[PDB]
Structures are given as structure tokens and as C-alpha cells.
Design an enzyme around this catalytic site. Structure first.
Site, PDB file in Angstrom:
ATOM      1  N   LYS A   1     -28.028  71.221  40.289  1.00 32.77           N
ATOM      2  CA  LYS A   1     -29.287  71.346  41.018  1.00 32.77           C
ATOM      3  C   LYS A   1     -29.594  70.096  41.834  1.00 32.77           C
ATOM      4  O   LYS A   1     -29.960  70.191  43.010  1.00 32.77           O
ATOM      5  CB  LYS A   1     -30.434  71.640  40.057  1.00 32.77           C
ATOM      6  CG  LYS A   1     -30.406  73.015  39.451  1.00 32.77           C
ATOM      7  CD  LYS A   1     -31.718  73.310  38.755  1.00 32.77           C
ATOM      8  CE  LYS A   1     -32.126  72.180  37.824  1.00 32.77           C
ATOM      9  NZ  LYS A   1     -31.298  72.152  36.593  1.00 32.77           N
TER      10      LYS A   1
ATOM     11  N   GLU B   1     -37.944  63.203  36.221  1.00 34.13           N
ATOM     12  CA  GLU B   1     -36.494  63.195  36.285  1.00 34.13           C
ATOM     13  C   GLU B   1     -35.978  61.792  36.006  1.00 34.13           C
ATOM     14  O   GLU B   1     -36.733  60.820  35.980  1.00 34.13           O
ATOM     15  CB  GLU B   1     -35.991  63.704  37.638  1.00 34.13           C
ATOM     16  CG  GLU B   1     -36.074  65.216  37.774  1.00 34.13           C
ATOM     17  CD  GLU B   1     -35.282  65.945  36.706  1.00 34.13           C
ATOM     18  OE1 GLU B   1     -34.044  65.820  36.697  1.00 34.13           O
ATOM     19  OE2 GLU B   1     -35.897  66.640  35.872  1.00 34.13           O
ATOM     20  N   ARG B   2     -34.667  61.706  35.795  1.00 33.92           N
ATOM     21  CA  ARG B   2     -34.062  60.491  35.270  1.00 33.92           C
ATOM     22  C   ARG B   2     -34.272  59.316  36.210  1.00 33.92           C
ATOM     23  O   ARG B   2     -34.157  59.445  37.430  1.00 33.92           O
ATOM     24  CB  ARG B   2     -32.575  60.719  35.037  1.00 33.92           C
ATOM     25  CG  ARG B   2     -32.293  61.903  34.149  1.00 33.92           C
ATOM     26  CD  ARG B   2     -30.888  62.403  34.322  1.00 33.92           C
ATOM     27  NE  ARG B   2     -30.626  63.545  33.459  1.00 33.92           N
ATOM     28  CZ  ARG B   2     -30.962  64.790  33.757  1.00 33.92           C
ATOM     29  NH1 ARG B   2     -31.568  65.053  34.899  1.00 33.92           N
ATOM     30  NH2 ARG B   2     -30.689  65.774  32.917  1.00 33.92           N
TER      31      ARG B   2
HETATM   32  N1  LIG Z   1     -18.703  67.166  44.950  1.00 34.44           N
HETATM   33  C1  LIG Z   1     -18.671  67.188  43.621  1.00 34.44           C
HETATM   34  N2  LIG Z   1     -17.515  66.872  42.990  1.00 34.44           N
HETATM   35  C2  LIG Z   1     -17.491  66.895  41.652  1.00 34.44           C
HETATM   36  N3  LIG Z   1     -18.465  67.195  40.798  1.00 34.44           N
HETATM   37  C3  LIG Z   1     -19.598  67.504  41.449  1.00 34.44           C
HETATM   38  C4  LIG Z   1     -19.777  67.523  42.818  1.00 34.44           C
HETATM   39  N4  LIG Z   1     -21.077  67.888  43.132  1.00 34.44           N
HETATM   40  C5  LIG Z   1     -21.649  68.078  41.970  1.00 34.44           C
HETATM   41  N5  LIG Z   1     -20.809  67.863  40.909  1.00 34.44           N
HETATM   42  C6  LIG Z   1     -21.151  67.992  39.500  1.00 34.44           C
HETATM   43  O1  LIG Z   1     -22.285  68.812  39.404  1.00 34.44           O
HETATM   44  C7  LIG Z   1     -22.789  68.653  38.055  1.00 34.44           C
HETATM   45  C8  LIG Z   1     -24.271  68.913  38.040  1.00 34.44           C
HETATM   46  O2  LIG Z   1     -24.950  67.697  38.419  1.00 34.44           O
HETATM   47  P1  LIG Z   1     -26.531  67.773  38.636  1.00 34.44           P
HETATM   48  O3  LIG Z   1     -26.823  68.051  40.072  1.00 34.44           O
HETATM   49  O4  LIG Z   1     -27.179  66.593  37.991  1.00 34.44           O
HETATM   50  O5  LIG Z   1     -26.889  69.077  37.782  1.00 34.44           O
HETATM   51  P2  LIG Z   1     -28.317  69.792  37.623  1.00 34.44           P
HETATM   52  O6  LIG Z   1     -29.175  69.197  38.697  1.00 34.44           O
HETATM   53  O7  LIG Z   1     -28.084  71.268  37.798  1.00 34.44           O
HETATM   54  O8  LIG Z   1     -28.824  69.464  36.248  1.00 34.44           O
HETATM   55  C9  LIG Z   1     -22.354  67.243  37.623  1.00 34.44           C
HETATM   56  O9  LIG Z   1     -21.499  67.298  36.489  1.00 34.44           O
HETATM   57  C10 LIG Z   1     -21.617  66.694  38.850  1.00 34.44           C
HETATM   58  O10 LIG Z   1     -20.538  65.849  38.512  1.00 34.44           O
HETATM   59 MG   LIG Z   2     -31.381  67.600  37.201  1.00 27.74          MG
END
Ligand SMILES: Nc1ncnc2c1ncn2[C@@H]1O[C@H](COP(=O)(O)OP(=O)(O)O)[C@@H](O)[C@H]1O
Ligand SMILES: [Mg+2]
Lengths: 161, 271
Positions: free
Chosen positions: A4, A30-31
Site C-alpha cells: 500500500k 504510520e511508522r
Molecule cells: N519495486 C519493488 N521491488 C521489490 N519489492 C517491492 C517493490 N515495491 C514494493 N515492494 C514490496 O512491497 C511490500 C509491501 O510494502 P508496503 O508498501 O509497506 O506494504 P503495505 O503498505 O501494503 O503495508 C514490501 O515487502 C516491499 O519490499
Molecule cells: Mg503501510
């Protein structure tokens, strides 16, 4: 873990850079690490200019280590900034709210001790209408627009929560 | 958990639907299969009528051997391919132990798959795309051609298939196949006339083709039946699991309602 915030980052890049309407980013519980990374990646990508202010994004951050009231009202703070940039500026504003479920769960945590009988699951009796009074300020009036990109946390991938 | 049980229930439900559909279509095919089997059975036994009325004892001296195994290319029929497999491999073990080299043809992708890592070194050729369509004579003509163009003139041979007994039972049978040499040597054949190397050669080739055809027909049938009963068993077991998981689902949803109600009540009582 579905992607997300990276999605909202792609959206920030593309949309907020390709826009001339004074975007606003509200970080609702958020973090802090991700907030600092987003700030430093906006700065170096020219969207935020620390010198000779030409910046086009205003950031609001109420993060996880804050009490529930702060994480419940920080989305309204972001709302108020975007509402200025629409009402008294005529602009077409972007509003990236991340994440809004933190707003809802902060509502749950305030209702817990606010002396009110709990509803289903554990949320407040006042969930639907309070989130509604919040979400109805995000609209396109005849004065301006506020298109809102909202990242929403689904607990345990339920979607029926 | 309610959602785990929901997902597992939906999975088993569509699995039961699939097995019921497979049972239906397998019975539909078995209809035509056992329709065509009987005249082909009369035919393929009238062929062997001579090797019966002549009592060809078979070569007791010769070294090499050819072993054919009849199956299909589709599993999920039962113990068909497993039965052919076990008999074939046991027979090869006992023939190589007795000092008799054997090479093996497999009609059907399933038997070739299940015996290739077992006896690849002793293997002649395999055939595929048998089992989808009702076998015909052309199948047998082709298999016999590539059995003869193989250049491997076998001392003797045995075809192994699943003799159709009826809708529930099949028997792994092993039919014999003689070579020109000993069918000529057989004293019993001195009662037949006008015979020499040439006409006995033609007759042996054509009887090879006939017995392969009759065996394919005996195996196509006795596979649609096994598939039909196996899919019946699958659907029945799937519905049993559906019933038991539905009991557990109702139990869990009642427990969930109780737990959430007790949460709400205990929360209201603290005020
Ligand atoms: N271009 C990318 N290459 C590798 N992993 C990716 C890429 N874009 C996103 N991710 C992965 O997407 C996952 C979700 O990250 P995040 O956006 O923090 O999740 P959410 O917001 O849904 O909680 C992570 O494990 C991140 O490493
Ligand atoms: Mg998140």
C-alpha cells in the site's frame, strides 16, 4: 505487506509531480521510519524545497507512538489544510491519507474508555457516522476539488471488518 | 477459524463437483466402450482360435523376449496402471534372472512413465495418445508396424492387459505371441497345409496386429469402468468430508457468536 505505501509512493511521484494543485499528505498513525524516508525522498526529488520555498506538498504527521486522540484527529488536520487550499484558494487539491484505518482504530481506542458500550468486533458505537463526518468534507464543491488517495489498512485481509 | 473452514469447504465442494462430472462422462464413454467390445472380442478370440486348437507349446529354448504392456495416457482410473506395472516388472525380473533378455513396449504414456526409471535399459518403444479416443484397428496396425520395423525379431512375447470381467472387476492377463521359428517347428502345425515360411510369416504378422487390437479394446473397456467407479468413490468421500466440515463450521460460527456476545456484555457490565 501487500504494497500500500509503495503504491502511494508511486502515486505521489507520478501524480503529485505532474500536478499544480498544492498536494497535502496526512500521515495517520504510520511508522516514523517510513515518514522520515518519505520526507527525505520528497526533498531530494524537488517536491519540497527547503530554500526559496516553491514546495507543493504540506505534510502532517501523527504517528504510531502517539495517543489515540492524536491519531484520530491528525486526519482532520490534513483535511483542514486541504480544505483551505480548496475553499480560499480555488485550487484542485490532492490529499494522500495514509493510513485511514489507523484513524478508525484510534477511534476504537478512544471509545474504549470514553464510557461507551462497544459495538461489533470491538469498534465504537460511533464509527460509521464519525468516519462519515470526516469523509464528507472530502468532496468537489463548486469552489474547488479535493481528490483523495487513501491507503486503508485491512486487518487480517478480511475486508468485512 | 471461520474463514479457514469456509475456504476448505468451498475447495472440497468444487472438487466433488469435478469428480461427479468426471464420473458422468466416464460412464458415457464406457457405454460405447462395452458396446464395441463384444464384436471385437468375438473377433480377437477367433484369431487365437488356431493357437488354441493347435496347442503351440512355445519356445522352451530361446533367449530373447518381447513384453508389451497395455494401458492409457490418463491416470486417475484406479489400480489399472499399477497392476500392469507390477506384473510387468515382476515378469522382467524373473525373466532376466532366468538368463533371458527381454525388451518392453508400452502402449500408453502412463505405463511408460511408471516403468521408465525402473527398466529403461530394457525398453524398445512406447506409444502415446491412446485412451482419449476409442481404440480402432488403425491403432493396432500402427503398433504392429512399428513392432516389426523395430527389427527386433523376438523369440517370443507376451502382451499384458486388463481383461474386462465386468463393471467392477478387471484381471491382469498375459497373452502369448509366438515367432515364425517355433510356430513352424510346432509339430501340431503339420496338420495344416499349404504352409511355409511365407504364409506363416504373413499370418503371424496379422495375428500380432489382431491381438494388439483386441487387447486395446479389452483395456479401453475396463478403464472407463474403473474410472467411473473411482470417481463415484471420490464424490462420495468428498460429500462425507463436506458434511463433517459443515458440522464443524456451524459449531464454530455458534462459538463465534457466543464469544462476541460475551465480549459486548462484559464490556457493558464494567460501566
Ligand atoms: N519495486 C519493488 N521491488 C521489490 N519489492 C517491492 C517493490 N515495491 C514494493 N515492494 C514490496 O512491497 C511490500 C509491501 O510494502 P508496503 O508498501 O509497506 O506494504 P503495505 O503498505 O501494503 O503495508 C514490501 O515487502 C516491499 O519490499
Ligand atoms: Mg503501510
Amino acid at each position: 505487506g501487500v504494497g500500500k505505501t509503495v503504491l502511494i509512493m508511486e502515486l505521489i511521484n507520478n501524480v503529485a509531480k505532474a500536478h499544480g494543485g498544492y498536494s497535502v499528505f496526512a500521515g495517520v498513525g504510520e511508522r516514523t521510519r517510513e515518514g522520515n524516508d518519505l520526507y527525505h525522498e520528497m526533498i531530494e526529488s524537488g517536491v519540497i524545497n527547503l530554500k526559496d520555498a516553491t514546495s507543493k506538498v504540506a505534510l502532517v504527521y501523527g504517528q504510531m507512538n502517539e495517543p489515540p486522540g492524536a491519531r484520530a484527529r491528525v486526519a482532520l488536520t490534513g483535511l483542514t489544510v486541504a480544505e483551505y487550499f480548496r475553499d480560499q484558494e480555488g485550487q484542485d487539491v490532492l490529499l494522500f491519507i495514509d493510513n485511514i484505518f489507523r484513524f478508525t482504530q484510534a477511534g476504537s481506542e478512544v471509545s474504549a474508555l470514553l464510557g461507551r458500550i462497544p459495538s461489533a468486533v470491538g469498534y465504537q458505537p460511533t464509527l460509521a457516522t464519525d468516519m462519515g463526518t470526516m469523509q464528507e468534507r472530502i468532496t468537489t464543491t463548486k469552489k474547488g476539488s479535493i481528490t483523495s488517495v487513501q491507503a486503508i489498512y485491512v486487518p487480517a485481509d478480511d475486508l468485512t471488518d | 477459524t471461520l474463514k479457514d473452514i469456509t475456504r476448505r469447504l468451498k475447495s472440497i465442494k468444487n472438487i466433488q463437483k469435478i469428480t461427479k462430472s468426471m464420473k458422468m462422462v466416464a460412464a458415457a464413454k464406457y457405454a460405447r466402450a462395452e458396446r464395441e467390445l463384444k464384436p471385437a472380442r468375438i473377433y480377437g478370440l477367433g484369431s487365437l482360435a488356431l493357437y488354441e486348437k493347435a496347442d503351440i507349446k512355445g519356445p522352451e529354448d530361446k533367449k530373447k523376449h518381447l513384453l508389451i504392456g497395455v494401458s492409457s495416457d490418463r491416470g486417475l482410473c484406479g489400480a489399472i496402471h499399477s497392476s500392469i506395472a507390477k506384473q510387468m516388472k515382476s515378469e522382467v525380473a524373473t525373466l532376466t534372472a532366468a538368463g533371458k533378455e527381454v525388451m518392453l513396449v508400452g502402449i500408453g504414456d502412463k505405463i511408460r512413465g511408471i516403468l521408465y526409471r525402473t527398466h529403461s535399459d530394457q525398453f524398445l518403444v512406447a506409444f502415446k495418445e491412446v485412451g482419449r479416443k476409442p481404440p480402432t484397428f488403425g491403432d493396432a496396425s500402427v503398433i504392429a508396424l512399428e513392432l516389426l520395423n523395430s527389427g527386433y525379431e523376438f523369440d517370443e512375447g507376451s502382451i499384458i492387459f486388463n481383461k474386462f470381467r465386468s463393471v467392477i472387476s478387471y484381471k491382469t492377463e498375459e497373452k502369448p505371441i509366438f515367432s515364425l521359428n517355433t510356430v513352424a517347428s510346432a509339430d501340431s502345425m503339420s496338420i495344416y497345409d499349404d504352409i511355409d515360411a511365407d504364409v506363416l510369416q504373413n499370418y503371424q504378422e496379422y495375428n500380432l496386429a489382431n491381438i494388439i487390437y483386441y487387447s486395446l479394446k479389452e483395456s479401453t473397456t475396463s478403464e472407463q469402468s474403473a474410472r467411473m467407479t473411482a470417481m463415484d468413490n471420490a464424490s462420495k468421500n468428498a460429500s462425507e468430508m463436506i458434511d463433517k466440515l459443515t458440522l464443524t463450521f456451524n459449531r464454530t460460527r455458534q462459538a463465534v457468536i457466543t464469544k462476541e456476545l460475551i465480549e459486548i456484555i462484559s464490556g457493558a457490565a464494567a460501566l
